[PDB]
Each structure stands twice: as structure tokens, then as C-alpha cells.
């Protein structure tokens, strides 16, 4: 799997999947990303993110 946020390859047996209100799904590879997301930021504007890269 790939983290739906930064895009790095999520290490098997690792990561959290957040189920949205509407039913949508987002697999985060780390707390750091989940938390960048909760701030309302978009991975594309973070230079450390594989997404941005």
C-alpha cells in the first residue's frame, strides 16, 4: 500500500486507516502525516512529501 497522504510506501503491519463521515477511506502511514492533514494542509505543499516530490 501507499499512504494516501504523502505517498510513501506504507510498511506492512503499519499505518492507520481513517474512515470519513461520507464513507471515504484514507490510509495514513504515520501520525506525522495524519497530523499535518488535521491542520488542513495538503501533502502537495509540503516539500518533504513524496507527493510534493
Amino acid at each position: 500500500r501507499e499512504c494516501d497522504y504523502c505517498g510513501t510506501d506504507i510498511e506492512p503491519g503499519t499505518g492507520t486507516m481513517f474512515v470519513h463521515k461520507d464513507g471515504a477511506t484514507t490510509h495514513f502511514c504515520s501520525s506525522k502525516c495524519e497530523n499535518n492533514a488535521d491542520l488542513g494542509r495538503e501533502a502537495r505543499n509540503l516539500e518533504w512529501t513524496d507527493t510534493a516530490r
Binding site: 506492512p12 503491519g13 492507520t16 486507516m17 481513517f18 474512515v19 470519513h20 464513507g23 477511506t25
Partner: protein, 132 residues
């Protein structure tokens, strides 16, 4: 009961106010008890995903309010671990009113449902829109 096929961290307590994920006319729920549960001196009875709890209607239609019904925990905010090591958490804590036979009192279930809930409550499941 049947194995949920997952490990749960009860995210709820007696006195907890959750969402009623169905169209029964019941908006909010108040956890009163947890089926089959016996705690320990000073421990607040805890309830989580896939637990059949007893409830009381906090908000909704006048005729539904104050009623002591049974239900099933469909979603929680606290994370739950699946067989592959992943964690799963939802946007809120919600349950669905159920009857003696465990059949949804309602017609439709609003929002997503944890797959695990299927393996215990079919009719509830077979009533679901989205099963995560």
C-alpha cells in the same frame, strides 16, 4: 459471541452520547449498559465496536425520546486493530437501534459500517449502505 475478527479498544462508557446511524427517528443515543459485560470495582462499564448495548434516546422524535431500546455499536473514534496489524478509526461514535432478534428497528442505515459488525449482526449488515 462470535469473534469480531479484530481487537477493540472500547471507546465508550455508560453515560456516553453517540449518534443513531439509522432513520428510526432517533438522533442521539445514551449508553446505559453493555450486554454481557461485568466490570470491576470503580470501573465505568465500557462499550465499543460490535457491542450490543442498551440505550436511551437523548434526542429525536417526541415518541422516540426517553425510550429504553437495545442497539449495536457500528462506529467509534477510538482505533481498532485488524489481523494485518493496521488500525482503523472512524469519524464518530454511532450505533444502530436493534430489536429482540437483532434486526434493525429502522429501514436504512446512515453512514459507513465496520465490516466486522457483519460477522455478528447479519440483518444489520445486510441493511448497510457502505461497509468499510
Amino acid at each position: 459471541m462470535e469473534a469480531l475478527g479484530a481487537d477493540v479498544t472500547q471507546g465508550l462508557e455508560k453515560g456516553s452520547l453517540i449518534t443513531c446511524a439509522d432513520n428510526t427517528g432517533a438522533r442521539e443515543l445514551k449508553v446505559i449498559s453493555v450486554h454481557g459485560y461485568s466490570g470491576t470495582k470503580n470501573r465505568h462499564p465500557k462499550a465499543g465496536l460490535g457491542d450490543k448495548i442498551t440505550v436511551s434516546v437523548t434526542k429525536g422524535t417526541p415518541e422516540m425520546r426517553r425510550q429504553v431500546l437495545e442497539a449495536v455499536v457500528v462506529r467509534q473514534r477510538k482505533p481498532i486493530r485488524r489481523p494485518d496489524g493496521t488500525r482503523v478509526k472512524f469519524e464518530d461514535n454511532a450505533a444502530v437501534i436493534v430489536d429482540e432478534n437483532e434486526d434493525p428497528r429502522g429501514t436504512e442505515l446512515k453512514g459507513p459500517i465496520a465490516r466486522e459488525v457483519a460477522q455478528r449482526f447479519g440483518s444489520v449488515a445486510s441493511a448497510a449502505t457502505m461497509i468499510v
